[PDB]
Amino acid sequence: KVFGRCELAAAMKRHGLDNYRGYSLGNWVCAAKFESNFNTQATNRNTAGSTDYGILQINSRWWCNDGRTPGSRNLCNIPCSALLSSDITASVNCAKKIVSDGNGMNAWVAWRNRCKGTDVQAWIRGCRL
Ligand SMILES: CC(=O)N[C@@H]1[C@@H](O)[C@H](O[C@@H]2O[C@H](CO)[C@@H](O[C@@H]3O[C@H](CO)[C@@H](O[C@@H]4O[C@H](CO)[C@@H](O)[C@H](O)[C@H]4NC(C)=O)[C@H](O)[C@H]3NC(C)=O)[C@H](O)[C@H]2NC(C)=O)[C@@H](CO)O[C@H]1O
Numbered sequence: 001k002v003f004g005r006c007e008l009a010a011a012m013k014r015h016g017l018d019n020y021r022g023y024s025l026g027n028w029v030c031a032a033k034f035e036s037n038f039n040t041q042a043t044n045r046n047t048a049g050s051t052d053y054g055i056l057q058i059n060s061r062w063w064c065n066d067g068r069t070p071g072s073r074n075l076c077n078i079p080c081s082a083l084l085s086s087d088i089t090a091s092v093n094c095a096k097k098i099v100s101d102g103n104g105m106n107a108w109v110a111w112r113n114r115c116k117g118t119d120v121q122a123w124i125r126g127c128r129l
């Protein structure tokens with residue numbers, strides 16, 4: 001599924017990401033935009049052989065099982081495929097764990113480089129939330 005901006009904002013808010021660990025909603029929408037272009041089926045391969053999955057590009061090195069990242073963890077206890085669903089529940093619940101794990105949203109490289117410090121509230125302009 002390719003989400004619309006406000007559509008994704010509403011879903012993320014429904015699922016409790018707004019202000020989660022202190023990160024306002026626009027931070028999450030900005031992160032998603034640059035991680036996946038709001039596309040739930042986004043995938044990308046990392047140099048070490050791990051893969052990143054879904055709207056928030058969650059890394060099989062740590063968070064999910066894809067059976068093809070040996071030595072990795074599965075800290076969200078889910079198949080990485082569940083992170084490609086039209087339904088964002090699994091991605092959001094896993095992102096909650098990731099952002100809690102010490103580095104906050106710096107876990108998302110596109111967020112640190114493209115959203116952090118910027119006017120992220122603009123990403124929710126016009127949305128009915
Ligand atoms: C090639 C490329 O850059 N692709 C991107 C992916 O890398 C990226 O996924 C992110 O990947 C990084 C590095 O593997 C990952 O960061 C690591 O996360 C672990 C787990 O949270 C950290 O370990 C924790 O450290 C804290 C603080 O030190 C400890 O308190 C805590 O106990 C540790 N937890 C565990 C379980 O051991 C690592 O320190 C940390 N590594 C670095 C260098 O930051 C992110 O979690 C991955 N992010 C996501 C969303 O999965 C993906 C998104 O950034 O983007 C690709 O481009």
